[PDB]
């Protein structure tokens, strides 16, 4: 058998984007743009996305050993409704909360920083090969954890590279489409995958 | 037939590069560098590059829903002559206007921003596969538009993902080497391709 083990998985991440804009006398310029994929915590994936189909308007995560907190449009936390993404040929289903990127208002001879947090959830096809100790996603991101890792019936003996607190298993999980199933959740440094 | 449809195409883009430099008491350091590929508009590709073989010293384009304008060395707009790129084994012809990257002058305990705009034009080999609704370039960039899309003889029915204003077709186009031909032009978010 040379065909890799194929299974369905769902990704959850927020496209944190903070851009620096320089406002000249008659023009505007981007002095710097910082794009980062912030993962979604288990509490939000369960109690907000799966339970109500909404994402928090803020991205709280760890990056370079710092608890960074990004706010969409620098506004207070608010529940944003998830909507389907733009149509694309030969692509799996995907949803997002924001479409237009935010930038600061125009103030003369001044630098300003405008943060944008766009919650994104996508259904990706995961692939794995022998010894099945890790799997990849349709986006090309590697996940160093066995697809069968878990706490039940000896699954704890499978390979895993992330800490214990970065993995969560939920029994009787009823998937909400934006029967019970055993849902696994892993919070990678750049995204959260559920399969 | 498994061989992808191969055709010649020309790319046009400007390597906008703005870097932040911190000048210490006895050293210099890069506090941040922002590199972006700004596309070249149809007016410049026709009236400046093809008509006269020169590129504007400024990059005006849309990025993250903002009309950003970058100036080379923060100087006024000027016509820059295109010259061949450095020799490289197994590489298609390419030309550029700037070679040395610009940085701000040294001023003590101060941050400074220096913008660099280097117009670049290259001849790349485009490839496409059935249903031929999209094609890739030698640089690995995807173009979500059928290679045969156009306004003539039913070509408008081909697949296209970009807006109407992002595509332009010119008849009787005489290619200028830095007989008439039907030249297609598409302004992608990061580059402009002509085939």
């Amino acid at each position: 058998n040379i065909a890799p083990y194929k299974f369905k998985a769902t990704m959850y991440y927020k496209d944190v984007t903070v851009s620096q804009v320089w406002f000249g006398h008659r023009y505007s310029q981007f002095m710097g743009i910082f794009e980062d994929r912030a993962p979604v915590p288990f509490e939000e994936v369960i109690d907000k996305i799966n339970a109500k189909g909404v994402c928090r308007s803020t991205a709280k995560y760890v990056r370079n050993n710092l608890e960074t907190t990004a706010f969409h449009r620098d506004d207070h936390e608010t529940d944003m409704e998830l909507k389907p993404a733009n149509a694309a040929t030969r692509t799996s289903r995907g949803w997002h909360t924001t479409d237009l990127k935010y930038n600061p208002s125009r103030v003369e001879a001044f630098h300003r920083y405008g943060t944008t947090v766009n919650c994104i959830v996508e259904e990706v096809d995961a692939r794995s090969v022998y010894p099945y100790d890790e799997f990849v996603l349709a986006t090309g991101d590697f996940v160093y954890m066995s697809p069968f890792y878990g706490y039940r019936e000896g699954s704890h003996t499978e390979h895993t590279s992330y800490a214990a607190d970065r993995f969560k298993q939920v029994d009787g999980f009823y998937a909400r489409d934006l029967a019970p199933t055993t849902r696994n959740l892993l919070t990678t440094p750049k995204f959260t995958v559920a399969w | 037939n498994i061989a992808p449809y191969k055709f010649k195409a020309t790319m046009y883009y400007k390597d906008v590069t703005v870097s932040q430099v911190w000048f210490g008491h006895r050293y210099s350091q890069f506090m941040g560098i922002f590199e972006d590929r700004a596309p070249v508009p149809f007016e410049e590709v026709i009236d400046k590059i093809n008509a006269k073989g020169v590129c504007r010293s400024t990059a005006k384009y849309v990025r993250n829903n903002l009309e950003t304008t970058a100036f080379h060395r923060d100087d006024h707009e000027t016509d820059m002559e295109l010259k061949p790129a450095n020799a490289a084994t197994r590489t298609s012809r390419g030309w550029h206007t700037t070679d040395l990257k610009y940085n701000p002058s040294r001023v003590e305990a101060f941050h400074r921003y220096g913008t660099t705009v280097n117009c670049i034009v290259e001849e790349v080999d485009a490839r496409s596969v059935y249903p031929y609704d999209e094609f890739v370039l030698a640089t690995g960039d995807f173009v979500y538009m059928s290679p045969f899309y156009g306004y003539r003889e039913g070509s408008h029915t081909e697949h296209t993902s970009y807006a109407a204003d992002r595509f332009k077709q010119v008849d009787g186009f005489y290619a200028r080497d830095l007989a008439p031909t039907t030249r297609n032009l598409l302004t992608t978010p990061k580059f402009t391709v002509a085939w």
Partner: peptide, 18 residues
């Protein structure tokens, strides 16, 4: 798929200015 992210999860033509 990676290059379709901008066309799938963002507006490419809308411009905002003040």
């Amino acid at each position: 798929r990676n290059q379709l992210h901008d066309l799938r999860f963002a507006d490419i033509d809308t411009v905002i200015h003040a």
